[PDB]
C-alpha cells in the first residue's frame, strides 16, 4: 500500500503491477514519506543510487541492524524488530524512528481503509517502541547525566543528520520531552552560553535595560556544550553571546511587545488628528516589520513546496492569528489616512486589534512554568463552555421571544425585535434583573398608567423559571464540569507545556537579535547577505568527533544491557513469577516423591525377600 502511494505521487502508473520488485531506492522513498519533513534517507542519497545502478567489501552495510529494524517495522514484524533493537548500536535513534514509523503507517492505513486491526496494532507498536526510548533515556540519566546529553544531541548521520530530540518532537512523544534529562538540557539551550542558573529573569532584564550589566554576568566556556546549527576581545564576545542567547532574545522581544502595547493604548485613548502622530508612526513600524518576520517564518520553514510551507505555518494557531490581525491593522491604517468618516471607522478597526493583542500576552505569559499550564487550562475548559453556551442559548431565546411578544404585541418588522430577544435576558445571568421592568405597575391611576397587555402576568413567572435554570442550574453545572475535568487537564497541560518548550527555544534561536521595531536592520542584513554570497539545516546539534562518537556509542550498549538485565531481574523477583515458579516446582515434586515411595515399596519388599533368603 505504501509503495503504490510513493510511486503514484512521484511520477503520475497508478496501480503498479504486482510483479514490481520494490528496490531499496523505492523503500527509501517510503521512509522519507513516513518520516516527513527534511528527512532524506541514506537509500536515496546520491551515493547509494550510484551503487544500485552499478550493481543491478563495499556491499555490506556498515551497521546492518539499522536497515533490519526499518525492514521489520515496515512489515509489521514486531517481535523480530524488538530483537533487532537490542542487538546493535544507535538504539535511541532506532526506537524514536520506529515510534514515528509505526505512527505514520497507522494514519496511512486508516486513510486507505485497511482493516482496523492494522491501525490499532501499529499504534500499539508505536507506544511500545516509544516506551523503550523513555526507559533507555532514564537508565542513561542514572549512570552519567553528562553523557546522556551527548546521546540526546549528537548528529545522527545514519538518520538524515537529525538528533534524538528532533526525532522525538517529530514523533510527538510527550513523555520523552518531559523527562528530567531533556528538560534540563532544553534549559541549557534557553540560557545559551550564559551560566546564570539563578534568578534568571531579573538579571537578564537588567542586562537589556542597562547594557553595562552584561559584563558582570557569568558566561560558560567555549567547550562546555556547543549546541549549534552548522559548522577587548573578551568584551566583544560577552556582548555577542549575551545578545544571541534565546532567553535574552525572548525578554528583548517581550519588552518590545510591552513597549508596543503601551504605545498603541496612547494613540487610541488620546485623539488622532489628520496625519499620524510620532507615537503612531512607531506603532505602524511594529506591525509591518512583524509582518515581514511572520512572512520569513513561512519561507524559511522545513518543507520545500510553498503550499507545504504554508500548511506547516497554519498549524500554529497563535502564528496565523498574528497575520490576520496584521492585515486587519493595515486595512485600519488605509481608512485612517483618508478623510472622515473613513478615519472614524479605521479608528474602530484599531480598537478591535486591542481585543487581540492583549490576548496575545497569554502566549508570552506561557513561558513561566505556573501561568503557562494555567493558559492551556483555559483553552480546554472553553470546549466545555461551548456546550454551556448552546444550552444557554435555547433558554435565553425562549424567555426572550416570549417576553418581547407578550409585552410588546403590535410591533412591525424591524431588526430591533431581534436585539430585544438577546438584550435584556443576557444581562440577567450577570446580576441585573432589570428590577423596574419586571412587573411594571399598569392599569391603575397614579396620572394614568397605560393599560396592561394581555397575559403580562406570565412575564414575571417565566422570568422566575429562566433565572433558576440560568444561575443555579446551568452555571452551577458548569462549575461541576470544571472541577471533574480539572485533574486530567492539569496533568495533560503540564506535560504539553513541557513538550512545547522545544518549540519555544528553537524559534527564538532562529529569530533575529534586534526587536520587532528594529528588525528591519537585521532583515536587510539577511536579504543583502543571501544575494551577495550568491554572487560571490535546522536544530541545535552537538556535532561530535569520531573518538567521542565511539565513546558515546559504548555508553549506550551498557545502558541497553543494564535495562534488559533489570527487566529480567524485576520479572524473576516479582511476586507473580515467584508464586508461579514455586507452584510448578511443587507439581514436579508430587510425581517425584510418589515415585520415591513406590520404589521404596519395592526396596522394602526386596529387603524382606533377602531376609527370607538369609
What residue ranges bind ligand Y01 (CB under 6 A)? Answer: 255-256, 258-263, 265-266, 278-279, 282, 286, 316-318, 355, 359, 362, 375-376, 378-380, 382, 389, 392-393, 395-396, 398-399, 413-419, 422-423, 426, 439, 441-442, 452, 457, 460-462, 464-466, 468-469, 517
- Which does residue 252 touch among ligand A1AIA, ligand Y01, a second copy, none (CB within 5 to 8 A, set by kind)? none
**What are the helix (H) ranges across 54-157?**
64-74, 78-86, 91-111, 116-143, 145-153
* Contact in structure between 431 and 389 (CB atoms under 8 Å): no
Report the residue number, 169 or 367, with the smaller CB distance to ligand A1AIA.
Answer: 367
Please state the closest distance from residue 523 (CB atom) to ligand Y01, in A: 16
Query: Using CA atoms, how far apart are residues 450 and 216, in angstroms rounded to an integer?
Result: 81
Query: Using CA atoms, how far apart are residues 95 and 101, in angstroms rounded to an integer?
Result: 10
* Contact in structure between 552 and 150 (CB atoms under 8 Å): yes
- Report the residue number whose CB is nearest to ligand Y01: 379
Query: Using CA atoms, how far apart are residues 119 and 127, in angstroms rounded to an integer?
Result: 13
Query: Using CA atoms, how far apart are residues 126 and 103, in angstroms rounded to an integer?
Result: 6
Of positions 58, 210, 233, 435, contacts a second copy by CB under 8 A: 435
Does 427 engage in binding with a second copy (CB under 8 A)?
A: yes
Of positions 3, 377, 492, 513, contacts a second copy by CB under 8 A: 377
Give the residue from 241, 227, 244 showing the smallest Cα distance to 544.
227
Please state the closest distance from residue 507 (CB atom) to ligand A1AIA, in A: 8
Please state the closest distance from residue 333 (CB atom) to a second copy, in A: 16
Contacts of 387 (CB under 8 A, 6+ apart): none
Query: Using CA atoms, how far apart are residues 483 and 124, in angstroms rounded to an integer?
Result: 32
| Residue 526: CB atoms within 10 Å | 13
Please state the closest distance from residue 353 (CB atom) to ligand A1AIA, in A: 12
Please state the closest distance from residue 425 (CB atom) to ligand Y01, in A: 8
SS3 call for 435 = helix
Concatenate the DSSP letters of all residues of 484-507 into one string: TTHHHHHHHHHHHHHHTHHHHHHH
For a second copy (CB under 8 A), the number of binding residues is: 123
Give the residue from 366, 372, 361 showing the smallest Cα distance to 258.
361
- Which does residue 116 touch among ligand A1AIA, ligand Y01, a second copy, none (CB within 5 to 8 A, set by kind)? none
- Which does residue 257 touch among ligand A1AIA, a second copy, ligand Y01, none (CB within 5 to 8 A, set by kind)? ligand A1AIA
- Which does residue 434 touch among ligand A1AIA, a second copy, ligand Y01, none (CB within 5 to 8 A, set by kind)? a second copy
Query: Using CA atoms, how far apart are residues 155 and 337, in angstroms rounded to an integer?
Result: 54
Does 482 engage in binding with a second copy (CB under 8 A)?
A: yes
- Which does residue 293 touch among a second copy, ligand Y01, ligand A1AIA, none (CB within 5 to 8 A, set by kind)? ligand A1AIA
228 forms bridges with which residues in the sheet?
Answer: 541
Does 594 engage in binding with a second copy (CB under 8 A)?
A: yes
Contact segment (CB under 8 A) with a second copy among 70-78, 212-220, 233-241, 479-487 equals: 479-487
Give the residue from 229, 223, 234 showing the smallest Cα distance to 246.
229
| Residue 478: CB atoms within 10 Å | 17
CA atoms within 13 A on the CB side of 205: 9
CA atoms within 13 A on the CB side of 151: 32
Does 571 engage in binding with a second copy (CB under 8 A)?
A: no
Question: Mask 107-146, x = binds a second copy (CB under 8 A)?
Answer: ----------------------------------------
Query: Using CA atoms, how far apart are residues 438 and 136, in angstroms rounded to an integer?
Result: 69
Report the residue number, 41 or 469, with the smaller CB distance to ligand Y01.
Answer: 469
Q: CA torsion angle for 189, 195, 200, 204 (degrees, to 10)?
A: -90
The whole-angstrom distance between residue 404's C-alpha and the CA centroid of its chain comes to 48
Does 201 engage in binding with a second copy (CB under 8 A)?
A: no
- Which does residue 15 touch among ligand Y01, ligand A1AIA, a second copy, none (CB within 5 to 8 A, set by kind)? none
Report the residue number, 88 or 425, with the smaller CB distance to ligand Y01.
Answer: 425
Does 317 engage in binding with a second copy (CB under 8 A)?
A: no
Q: Is the dihedral of CA 18, 20, 26, 27 positive or negative?
A: positive
- Which does residue 364 touch among a second copy, ligand A1AIA, ligand Y01, none (CB within 5 to 8 A, set by kind)? ligand A1AIA
Query: Using CA atoms, how far apart are residues 382 and 352, in angstroms rounded to an integer?
Result: 22
- Which does residue 201 touch among ligand Y01, a second copy, ligand A1AIA, none (CB within 5 to 8 A, set by kind)? none
| Residue 252: CB atoms within 10 Å | 22
Query: Using CA atoms, how far apart are residues 167 and 96, in angstroms rounded to an integer?
Result: 6
Contacts of 419 (CB under 8 A, 6+ apart): none
Contacts of 475 (CB under 8 A, 6+ apart): 429
| Binding residues vs ligand A1AIA (CB under 6 A) | 253-254, 256-257, 290, 293, 322, 364, 516
Interaction residues for a second copy, span 510-569 (CB under 8 A): none
Report the residue number, 239 or 394, with the smaller CB distance to a second copy.
Answer: 394
SS3 call for 313 = helix
Please state the closest distance from residue 191 (CB atom) to a second copy, in A: 24
Please state the closest distance from residue 289 (CB atom) to ligand A1AIA, in A: 9
Contact segment (CB under 8 A) with a second copy among 261-269, 296-304, 540-548, 552-560 equals: 261-269
Give the residue from 465, 473, 265, 254 showing the smallest Cα distance to 366.
254
Question: Mask 394-423, x = binds a second copy (CB under 8 A)?
Answer: xx-xx--xx-xxx--xxxxx---x---x-x
Report the residue number, 51 or 362, with the smaller CB distance to ligand Y01.
Answer: 362
Please state the closest distance from residue 268 (CB atom) to ligand A1AIA, in A: 18
- Which does residue 607 touch among a second copy, ligand A1AIA, ligand Y01, none (CB within 5 to 8 A, set by kind)? a second copy
Question: Mask 318-357, x = binds a second copy (CB under 8 A)?
Answer: -----------------------x--xx-xx-xxx-xx--
Does 597 engage in binding with a second copy (CB under 8 A)?
A: yes
Amino acid at each position: 500500500h505504501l509503495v503504490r502511494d510513493v510511486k503514484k505521487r512521484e511520477y503520475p502508473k497508478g496501480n503498479l503491477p504486482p510483479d514490481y520488485r520494490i528496490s531499496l531506492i523505492d523503500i527509501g522513498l517510503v521512509i522519507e514519506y513516513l518520516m516527513g519533513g527534511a528527512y532524506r534517507c541514506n537509500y536515496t542519497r546520491k551515493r547509494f543510487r550510484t551503487l544500485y545502478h552499478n550493481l543491478f567489501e563495499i556491499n555490506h552495510f556498515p551497521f546492518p541492524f539499522h536497515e533490519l529494524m526499518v525492514w521489520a517495522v515496515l512489515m509489521k514484524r514486531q517481535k523480530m524488530a524488538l530483537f533487532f533493537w537490542q542487538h546493535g548500536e544507535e538504539a535511541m535513534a532506532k526506537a524514536l524512528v520506529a515510534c514515528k514509523l509505526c505512527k505514520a503507517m497507522a494514519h496511512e492505513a486508516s486513510e486507505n481503509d485497511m482493516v482496523d486491526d492494522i491501525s490499532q496494532e501499529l499504534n500499539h507498536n508505536s507506544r511500545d517502541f516509544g516506551q523503550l526510548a523513555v526507559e533507555l533515556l532514564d537508565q542513561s540519566y542514572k549512570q552519567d547525566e553528562q553523557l546522556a546529553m551527548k546521546l540526546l544531541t549528537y548528529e545522527l548521520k545514519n538518520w538524515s543528520n537529525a538528533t534524538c530530540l528532533q526525532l522525538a518532537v517529530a514523533a510527538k512523544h510527550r513523555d520523552f520531552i518531559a523527562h528530567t534529562c531533556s528538560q534540563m538540557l532544553l534549559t541549557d539551550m534557553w540560557m545559551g552560553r550564559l551560566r546564570m542558573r539563578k534568578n534568571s529573569g531579573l538579571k537578564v532584564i537588567l542586562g537589556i535595560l542597562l547594557p553595562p550589566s552584561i559584563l558582570s554576568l557569568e558566561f560558560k566556556n567555549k567547550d562546555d556544550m556547543p549546541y549549534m546549527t552548522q559548522a577587548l576581545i573578551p568584551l566583544g564576545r560577552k556582548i555577542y553571546e549575551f545578545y544571541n542567547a534565546p532567553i535574552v532574545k525572548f525578554w528583548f522581544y517581550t519588552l518590545a511587545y510591552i513597549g508596543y502595547l503601551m504605545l498603541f493604548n496612547y494613540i487610541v485613548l488620546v485623539k488622532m488628528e489628520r496625519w499620524p502622530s510620532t507615537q503612531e508612526w512607531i506603532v505602524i513600524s511594529y506591525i509591518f516589520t512583524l509582518g515581514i518576520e511572520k512572512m520569513r517564518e513561512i519561507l524559511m520553514s522545513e518543507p520545500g513546496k510553498l503550499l507545504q510551507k504554508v500548511k506547516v505555518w497554519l498549524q500554529e494557531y497563535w502564528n496565523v492569528t498574528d497575520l490576520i490581525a496584521i492585515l486587519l491593522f493595515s486595512v485600519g491604517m488605509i481608512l485612517r489616512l483618508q478623510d472622515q468618516p473613513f478615519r472614524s471607522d479605521g479608528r474602530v478597526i484599531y480598537c478591535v486589534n486591542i481585543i487581540y493583542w492583549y490576548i496575545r500576552l497569554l502566549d508570552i505569559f506561557g513561558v513561566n512554568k505556573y501561568l503557562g499550564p494555567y493558559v492551556m487550562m483555559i483553552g480546554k475548559m472553553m470546549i466545555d463552555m461551548m456546550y454551556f453556551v448552546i444550552i444557554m442559548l435555547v433558554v435565553l431565546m425562549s424567555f426572550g421571544v416570549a417576553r418581547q411578544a407578550i409585552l410588546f404585541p403590535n410591533e412591525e418588522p424591524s431588526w430591533k425585535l431581534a436585539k430585544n430577544i438577546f438584550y435584556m435576558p443576557y444581562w440577567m445571568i450577570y446580576g441585573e434583573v432589570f428590577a423596574d421592568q419586571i412587573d411594571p405597575p399598569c392599569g391603575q391611576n397614579e396620572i394614568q398608567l397605560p393599560p396592561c397587555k394581555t397575559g403580562a402576568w406570565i412575564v414575571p413567572a417565566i422570568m422566575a423559571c429562566y433565572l433558576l435554570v440560568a444561575n443555579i442550574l446551568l452555571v452551577n453545572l458548569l462549575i461541576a464540569v470544571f472541577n471533574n475535568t480539572f485533574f486530567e487537564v492539569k496533568s495533560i497541560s503540564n506535560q504539553v507545556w513541557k513538550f512545547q518548550r522545544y518549540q519555544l527555544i528553537m524559534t527564538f534561536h532562529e529569530r533575529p537579535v534586534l526587536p520587532p521595531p528594529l528588525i528591519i536592520f537585521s532583515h536587510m542584513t539577511m536579504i543583502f547577505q543571501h544575494l551577495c554570497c550568491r554572487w560571490r539545516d535546522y536544530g541545535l546539534k552537538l556535532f561530535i568527533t569520531d573518538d567521542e562518537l565511539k565513546k558515546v556509542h559504548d555508553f549506550e550498549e551498557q545502558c541497553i544491557e543494564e535495562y534488559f538485565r533489570e527487566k529480567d531481574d524485576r520479572f524473576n523477583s516479582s511476586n507473580d513469577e515467584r508464586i508461579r515458579v514455586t507452584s510448578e516446582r511443587v507439581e514436579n515434586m508430587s510425581m517425584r516423591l510418589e515415585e520415591v515411595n513406590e520404589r521404596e515399596h519395592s526396596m522394602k519388599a526386596s529387603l524382606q525377600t533377602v531376609d527370607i533368603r538369609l
